[PDB]
Design a protein around this ligand. Structure first.
Ligand SMILES: *[C@@H]1O[C@H](CO)[C@@H](O[C@@H]2O[C@H](CO)[C@@H](O[C@@H]3O[C@H](CO[C@H]4O[C@H](CO)[C@@H](O)[C@H](O)[C@@H]4O)[C@@H](O)[C@H](O[C@H]4O[C@H](CO[C@@H]5O[C@H](CO)[C@@H](O)[C@H](O)[C@@H]5O)[C@@H](O)[C@H](O)[C@@H]4O)[C@@H]3O)[C@H](O)[C@H]2NC(C)=O)[C@H](O)[C@H]1NC(C)=O
Ligand SMILES: C[C@H](N[C@H](CCc1ccccc1)C(=O)O)C(=O)N1[C@H](C(=O)O)C[C@@H]2CCC[C@@H]21
Ligand SMILES: *[C@@H]1O[C@H](CO)[C@@H](O)[C@H](O)[C@H]1NC(C)=O
Ligand SMILES: *[C@@H]1O[C@H](CO)[C@@H](O)[C@H](O)[C@H]1NC(C)=O
Ligand SMILES: [Zn+2]
Length: 598
């Protein structure tokens, strides 16, 4: 009967979890070796271990049907068994799984090996995205130079893998249906355990959208004064190569030319970092210090011994795109980052260390629970710290910001600077998955795949390519996450919920009072707050043991994803910016782009 079986099932799960952790450790090591050192030998090794683990998962999924798990009394045991039914790609027949793995590594390695020629010297053709091309995109204000690097990169990282991407969509769809989801869109959405999740995001996005339109309008106005009306039109989408980022996902690199008050200070601490002799090691030690100051977990010795925190100086190929790794043992956690000494990189260091902290907080959990409450939670942790490290308050403490007077106009500059990252990112993040959902669901014919991409980038972000594109190009995979098959909705969710976490953490730290002008949300520093740390410990140690609303409740008593906190943060900017656009008769909104020929 069921009473004896449930007792046996508990013993089965305890053993199986340990076995899965150990088998996944082996797969992860292989994936790490390939990511740090791209070779045909390492690819073969990585993909063969994965096929072996997939085969074992099939046996596991099959074995769950032998247990009457849906009949059990324990919610915890049922939740664990349910986790074990979720095969994903491992549901594919042996040969199809092997083909998908070959397709995925072909795309990620193509991206990682992209090299372009120097604009000024066609002899020098060893310029990688990280750091060479990104340096030019972020620093150059020569629109024809920017356009050149845009075209070269997108042609190599995007168009070159069209056929591979098509096969990936086919196999992703096949895998989803084998798991009885309609498509890979629904498979991705299952991670959020909420049948109204899409609508919830539409609703939140609609509330923030008008603020984005105002920022867009003002930035376009300021770019016209810089580049002139031949380069930037008043009424059209912004030419994306002028926004200081290869994908126009963040605009903070052009802050010096679009800032509300150019005679008042704009925080940019890169020069001081360099002056004070900062290194990648110091940046990571500072990040570690922040976490420990909050009474959270110190980085283990394995992290320092095994991480790769600087780009290797031999001729080898690797994935430089920053990442954090869990090896599912004890204290074996690693970062791989091609760290540069800049302000934005300091934020990225904290982002990645947020992942590491999460890994450490839930490593005592059974294997199936050793992941985020939802994917957005994992992305939010580090960004919460980054919000406080970016404050004038904190940057002055660590001696990176000198002779700073925090008047109303400096405050507006800082809010605007933050918005150029945080608000600008929202429509970007939404479109990355909206696009892939539409392909996964079979809503766009293959003949229209590229213009379907640029249509969304137009509709939501109001940006366009610097040159005319067509269905002869394929631009989506020029973004890492698209080439590497990493779901993007996590970042949209993160950018919303991180303000929920930040606001609550700041109240707990005594750093925010809505009725005290001395304690504004935009100058909150949670450094050294054990009270904020405690809330994180309560939430992060849970892992995926409970549905995400219970994890949020453990942090601050709330159970709902809400746009209230992000709106509250930027409210002073909104009021000012609305008035400023009216003062300057700034055109808001945009005409449909002519940059993608059907
Ligand atoms: C995605 O959805 C799929 C459905 O679209 C689903 O596929 C179905 O899975 C079922 C297994 O859960 C499977 O059901 C079995 O069918 C066998 C015969 O099917 C054949 O004939 C049918 C023609 O009429 C065709 O439609 C099929 O294609 C096949 O040719 C049965 O022999 C089998 O039975 C046995 O198992 C049941 C289940 O027992 C359960 O557990 C305990 C036993 O330990 C019971 O006490 C309990 O009550 C419960 O019933 C026993 O009752 C029985 O005695 C037999 O031992 C079973 O019904 C079905 O064939 C399959 N396909 C289709 C088209 O329906 C996928 O599994 C889903 N995938 C995922 C990942 O979720
Ligand atoms: C740098 C970071 N990269 C990693 C990608 C994660 C990953 C890496 C490899 C395989 C699967 C997932 C991350 O930590 O999420 C990243 O791409 N982004 C996103 C991005 O740059 O697109 C925005 C997020 C806010 C700050 C940086 C974060
Ligand atoms: C990269 O891998 C090759 C074999 O594929 C190995 O011989 C070499 O040591 C690795 N290089 C580095 C720098 O680790
Ligand atoms: C630090 O954390 C421990 C347990 O994680 C807790 O017992 C202790 O009270 C914390 N320190 C402070 C000052 O709250
Ligand atoms: Zn992340």
């Amino acid at each position: 009967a069921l009473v004896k079986e449930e007792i046996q099932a508990k013993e089965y799960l305890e053993n199986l979890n340990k076995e899965l952790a150990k088998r996944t450790n082996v797969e992860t090591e292989a994936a790490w070796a390939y990511g740090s050192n791209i070779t045909d030998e390492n690819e073969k090794k990585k993909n063969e271990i994965s096929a072996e683990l997939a085969k074992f998962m099939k046996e596991v999924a099959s074995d769950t049907t032998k247990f009457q798990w849906r009949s059990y009394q324990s919610e915890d045991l049922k939740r664990q068994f349910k986790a074990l039914t979720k095969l994903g790609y491992a549901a594919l027949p042996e040969d199809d799984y092997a083909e998908l793995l070959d397709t995925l590594s072909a795309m990620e390695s193509n991206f990682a090996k992209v090299k372009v020629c120097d604009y000024k010297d066609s002899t020098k053709c060893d310029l990688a995205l990280d750091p060479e091309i990104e340096e030019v995109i972020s620093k150059s204000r020569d629109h024809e130079e920017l356009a050149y690097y845009w075209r070269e990169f997108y042609d190599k990282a995007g168009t070159a893998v069209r056929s591979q991407f098509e096969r990936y969509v086919e196999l992703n769809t096949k895998a989803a249906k084998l798991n009885n989801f309609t498509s890979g869109a629904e498979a991705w959405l299952d991670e959020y355990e909420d049948d109204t999740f899409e609508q919830q995001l539409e609703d939140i996005f609609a509330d923030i959208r008008p603020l984005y339109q105002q920022i867009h309008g003002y930035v376009r106005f300021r770019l016209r004064k810089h580049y002139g009306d031949a380069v930037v039109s008043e009424t059209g989408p912004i030419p994306m190569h002028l926004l200081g980022n290869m994908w126009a996902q963040q605009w903070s690199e052009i802050a010096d030319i679009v800032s509300p008050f150019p005679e008042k200070p704009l925080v940019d601490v890169s020069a001081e970092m360099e002056k004070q002799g900062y290194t990648p090691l110091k940046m990571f030690q500072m990040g570690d210090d922040f976490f420990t100051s909050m009474n959270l977990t110190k980085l283990p010795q394995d992290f320092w011994d095994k991480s790769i925190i600087e780009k290797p100086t031999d001729g080898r190929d690797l994935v430089c795109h920053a990442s954090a790794w869990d090896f599912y043992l004890t204290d074996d956690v690693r970062i791989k980052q091609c760290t540069r000494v800049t302000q934005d990189q300091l934020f990225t260091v904290h982002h990645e260390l947020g992942h590491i902290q999460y890994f450490l907080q839930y490593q005592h959990q059974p294997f199936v629970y050793r992941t985020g409450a939802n994917p957005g939670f994992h992305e939010a942790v580090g960004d919460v710290l980054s919000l406080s490290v970016s404050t004038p308050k904190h940057l002055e403490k660590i001696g990176l910001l000198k002779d700073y007077v925090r008047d109303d106009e400096a405050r507006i500059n800082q809010l605007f600077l933050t918005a150029l990252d945080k608000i600008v990112f929202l429509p970007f993040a939404f479109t990355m998955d909206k696009y892939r959902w539409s392909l996964f669901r079979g809503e766009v014919d293959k003949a229209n795949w590229n213009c379907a991409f640029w249509k969304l980038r137009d509709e939501y972000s109001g940006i366009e390519p610097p040159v005319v594109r067509s269905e002869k190009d394929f631009d989506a995979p020029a973004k890492y996450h698209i080439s590497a098959d990493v779901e993007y909705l996590r970042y949209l969710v993160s950018f919303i919920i991180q303000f929920q976490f930040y606001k609550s953490a700041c109240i707990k730290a005594g750093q925010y009072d809505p009725d005290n002008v001395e304690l504004p949300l935009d100058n909150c520093d949670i450094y050294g707050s054990a009270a904020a740390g405690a809330a994180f410990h309560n939430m992060l140690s849970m892992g995926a043991s409970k549905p995400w609303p219970d994890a949020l409740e453990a942090f601050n008593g709330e159970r709902i994803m809400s746009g209230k906190a992000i709106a509250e943060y930027f409210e002073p900017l909104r009021v000012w910016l609305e008035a400023e656009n009216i003062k300057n008769n700034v055109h808001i909104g945009w005409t449909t782009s002519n940059k993608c020929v059907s």
